[PDB]
């Protein structure tokens, strides 16, 4: 599995 | 520039349509023109770049994923090769103008601590996007210009922000996937992952009103990939 | 064009990897560049043809329905419309590219009944897409033009193809929501509806091994929209 | 609620 970065929001 | 004869408020407005329609291109091309007026961004404008060229980007990263994929499987005609070379000329492509328009632009001594951050840490993942695709003595040069914004992010936010701001652990969490998944240093990545967490936690009380659903997000992503990473 | 240097089975294998890599833009360069190579196209190369095209134009009718219904809410500056119209324009562009592709190149006497009742229908479909969004003079026109492909696909569906045939079922799927959203002709579209349902299952052992999860997917269709419709 | 059309398939 990939690490997860920051997501996008808003 | 394409955008040049419109209004900056005419930009902005035409970014949040597109968001809403989904018209990602569109909202990073309206957006591109916005900064290219030369004026500060607000936090609600630097996020709607940050939205409209994530958008952009993720998708030709998850396309070029996948076409590596199909390319490593095979080697084990050229057209494979050709398509993931061309997708992967057009990420690089927006990763340039990305990291253009902030040296051009946006990154600068003055301004708050957040936009500074933001920046430096925006820096650090377009050059992260570069490295994942990258190979010869342009890789080189491309991880190290990644971790030193990573860095120079870093040292502001650590001076300048309390430790659940959701700019300063979201650059703490795309730096502990660069060290992860670009450095080969696992070690870096869950020490940071891990310090960055507890310190937050240690320090819950300084949660804004404003933005405590971001920060808890991302703490909540730190112990995901300290999870997955043990 | 900018792929009249590549081969066409380069071309149809492109397809598939954009295809795979959801870069649907890119597929439907292929395939048009395949269609420009002046040979025929087969039963899955039509498909390819046709998922590229329709996910293009799908985002466009998508976005365009989001700008218009923020357009006429605020009917209740200047950017709404415009950013509607510069959407409307490149949906406008995509399908006078497609319906340009069937009249040179797709469209003929010859060929089996699948391929002919498929391009017509994809001239229907097409033609449907510009009268979503056309007004005037330009509106009339459209909508005959529509119809009549249509009309032609279904006198030719009606002879040679089975009942439960998917390119027949789909063609009547779409025709009858032309009559109902386009046309202003709920009866028409509900009458083809039910006639298309009853028929098909009127003569149900007509199904084929190699396509029969695509007639019953359109059954179920047709049976969605008569719920809807009354 | 809109009417369905064929969908993409395949
Ligand atoms: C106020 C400001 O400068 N902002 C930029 C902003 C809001 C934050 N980011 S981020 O720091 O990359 C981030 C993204 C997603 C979450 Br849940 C988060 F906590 C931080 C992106 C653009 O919006
Ligand atoms: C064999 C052939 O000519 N084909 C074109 C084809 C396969 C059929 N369509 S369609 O007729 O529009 C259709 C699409 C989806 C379903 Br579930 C269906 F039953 C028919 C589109 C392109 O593939
Ligand atoms: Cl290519
Ligand atoms: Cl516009
Ligand atoms: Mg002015
Ligand atoms: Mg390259
Ligand atoms: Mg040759
Ligand atoms: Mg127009």
């Known amino acids: 599995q990939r690490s997860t970065s920051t997501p996008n929001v808003h | 520039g394409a955008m040049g004869s419109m209004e900056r408020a005419s930009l902005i407005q035409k970014a949040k349509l597109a968001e809403q329609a989904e018209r990602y291109e569109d909202?990073?091309?309206?957006?591109?023109?916005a900064v290219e007026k030369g004026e500060e961004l607000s936090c609600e404008e630097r996020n709607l770049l940050s939205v409209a060229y994530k958008n952009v980007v993720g998708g030709q990263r998850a396309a070029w994923r996948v076409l590596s994929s199909i390319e490593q499987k095979?080697?084990?005609?050229?057209?494979v090769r050709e398509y993931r070379e061309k997708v992967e000329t057009e990420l690089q492509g927006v990763c340039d103008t990305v990291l253009g328009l902030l040296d051009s632009h946006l990154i600068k001594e003055a301004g708050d601590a957040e936009s500074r951050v933001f920046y430096l840490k925006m820096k650090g993942d377009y050059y992260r996007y570069l490295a994942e695709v990258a190979t010869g003595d342009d890789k080189k040069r491309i991880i190290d210009s990644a971790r030193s914004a990573y860095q120079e992010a870093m040292d502001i936010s650590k001076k300048e922000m309390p430790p659940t701001n959701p700019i300063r652990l979201g650059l703490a969490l795309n730096f502990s996937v660069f060290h992860?998944?670009?450095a080969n240093s696992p070690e870096?990545?869950?020490?940071?992952?891990?310090?960055?967490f507890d310190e937050a936690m240690?320090?819950?009380h300084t949660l804004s009103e404003d933005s405590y659903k971001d920060s808890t997000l991302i703490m909540q992503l730190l112990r995901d990939n300290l999870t997955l990473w043990t």
Request: negative net charge; without cysteine; glycine residues 8%.
């Open chain 2, 27 to 33: 909202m990073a091309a309206f957006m591109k023109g």
């Open chain 2, 74 to 79: 095979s080697n084990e005609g050229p057209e």
């Open chain 2, 180 to 182: 992860y998944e670009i």
């Open chain 2, 188 to 196: 870096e990545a869950i020490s940071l992952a891990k310090t960055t």
């Open chain 2, 202 to 204: 240690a320090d819950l």
